[PDB]
Design a protein around this nucleic acid. Structure first.
Length: 60
DNA sequence: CCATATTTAATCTTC
DNA sequence: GGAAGATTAAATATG
């Protein structure tokens, strides 16, 4: 249950795909999980928090 | 239409 | 004290 703290390489992989789509399909999340070595749930949640981060930034 | 999955909005937790 | 990760319940989307 300890919270995830991403390495640089892992965060770089997340931001690069988020640049392609803010909502990766399960297949994309699945191959992200293999690359980063993290669970699919961690992948899904990182994008969710990231999408919520950009929504606030778009509201002045 | 219906069962299941994904996303949203808000919040809680933790470093 | 601030940001990001994790949780929740409700809303929306999907097959």
């Amino acid at each position: 249950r300890p919270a995830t703290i991403l390495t640089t390489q892992q965060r770089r992989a997340f931001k690069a795909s988020f640049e392609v789509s803010s909502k990766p399909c399960r297949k994309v999340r699945e191959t992200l999980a293999a690359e980063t070595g993290l669970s699919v749930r961690v992948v899904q949640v990182w994008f969710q928090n990231q999408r919520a981060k950009m929504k606030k930034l778009a509201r002045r």
